[PDB]
Design a protein around this ligand. Structure first.
Ligand code: CYZ
Lengths: 10, 49, 49
């Protein structure tokens, strides 16, 4: 279980 | 990085503060980010157009 | 990598076996090279042509 942070950019 | 309070905010600030383990995201590699977190070799080549 | 003697030749071999402190050179960042030595971020971009 790894937390993958990301942003919503198309 | 904030000028007034010297704290990182954003996905990088989340990575420094331990909330997030990795950032597989469209994040540009720069010098100030490289000082505080470690990047892989870049996966996408982009430029001003 | 040499054929079954597992010896790096060339500039990479000079890095692995202690001959050279650094390789400021047109050396391609490849996976098999990455396992043995260290690469900085790519100073130039290219393609097989
Ligand atoms: N146009 S080019 O191939 O001469 C070229 C290619 C590249 C340059 C700079 C130039 Cl001038 N810098 C980048 C660098 C900026 C950050 C992202 C990748 C490294 C660190 N590498 S690259 O994308 O390989």
């Amino acid at each position: 279980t790894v937390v993958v942070t990301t942003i919503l950019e198309s | 990085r904030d000028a007034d309070t010297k704290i990182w905010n954003g996905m990088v600030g989340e990575l420094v503060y331990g909330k997030a383990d990795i950032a597989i995201a469209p994040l540009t590699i720069t010098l100030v980010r490289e000082e505080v977190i470690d990047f892989s070799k870049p996966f996408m080549s982009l430029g001003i157009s």
